[PDB]
Amino acid sequence: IVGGTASVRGEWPWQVTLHTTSPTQRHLCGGSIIGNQWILTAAHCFYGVESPKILRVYSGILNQSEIKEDTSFFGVQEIIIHDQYKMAESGYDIALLKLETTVGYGDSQRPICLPSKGDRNVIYTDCWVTGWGYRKLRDKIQNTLQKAKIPLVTNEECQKRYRGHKITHKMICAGYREGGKDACKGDSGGPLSCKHNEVWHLVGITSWGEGCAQRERPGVYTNVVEYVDWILEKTQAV
Numbered sequence: 001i002v003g004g005t006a007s008v009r010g011e012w013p014w015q016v017t018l019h020t021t022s023p024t025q026r027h028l029c030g031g032s033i034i035g036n037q038w039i040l041t042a043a044h045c046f047y048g049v050e051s052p053k054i055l056r057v058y059s060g061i062l063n064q065s066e067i068k069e070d071t072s073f074f075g076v077q078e079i080i081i082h083d084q085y086k087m088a089e090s091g092y093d094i095a096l097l098k099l100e101t102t103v104g105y106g107d108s109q110r111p112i113c114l115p116s117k118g119d120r121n122v123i124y125t126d127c128w129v130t131g132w133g134y135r136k137l138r139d140k141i142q143n144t145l146q147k148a149k150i151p152l153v154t155n156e157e158c159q160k161r162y163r164g165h166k167i168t169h170k171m172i173c174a175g176y177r178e179g180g181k182d183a184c185k186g187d188s189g190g191p192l193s194c195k196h197n198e199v200w201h202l203v204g205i206t207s208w209g210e211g212c213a214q215r216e217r218p219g220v221y222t223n224v225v226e227y228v229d230w231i232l233e234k235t236q237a238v
């Protein structure tokens, strides 16, 4: 996250750090708890990931330094990538991780509500992007979870900022015209959380962008409301 500040412990309790174990253990992507055995994240995180056996999900983490060999984590039973996904820039950048065990909810780890179908018309004015990503273009994964408040931008405005790309209605953008605050390398897969009627909703999944916090280059996110039927299809299968 560029231009953000340290989060307080328990502030974003749906935020997870997805680590890979191959070749060495390190943070790979962000993710969000949406159900007791379900993590919602970005499909692009799995490029070259041949098996869910190399993945570890850590919930209730503020600092990456809390993670050692003796730290509990959730194993991944299954990786579910949207079947229309080709690349982040073309959309369908959404995946579900089915966990091997059940997340016990509490003040450190709990789910974020998915947006409502009726709420596709609501105007979100209180949106935050979080993650352990870079604070500048050439950096390293941050120890402390960062946060930044970012305004949502219309599809029309985002399309003007991305000449040569196709910004679909299954994408949602957020950024300041002058830049300064944005998601950056390592934040992908994490949430874009918006507060409405005292309830937080998972509005976006950090997906892609041209650089980090550049003027007239907002972050592009998976527009979660457009995938609520797909999420229910996969999580509520009979």
Ligand SMILES: NC[C@H]1CC[C@H](C(=O)N[C@@H](Cc2ccccc2)c2nc(-c3ccc4c(N)[nH]nc4c3)c(Cl)[nH]2)CC1
Pocket: 026, 027, 028, 029, 044, 045, 046, 133, 140, 141, 182, 183, 184, 185, 186, 187, 188, 206, 207, 208, 209, 210, 211, 212, 213, 218, 219, 220
């Ligand atoms: N302004 C809008 C934002 C939107 C999100 C975007 C992003 O985050 N894209 C992803 C894509 C990706 C690429 C490779 C694996 C998973 C996902 C990324 N993640 C790392 C990354 C990850 C872990 C790292 C680590 N352990 N050390 N360094 C690390 C850097 C790199 Cl590089 N690019 C950056 C621009």
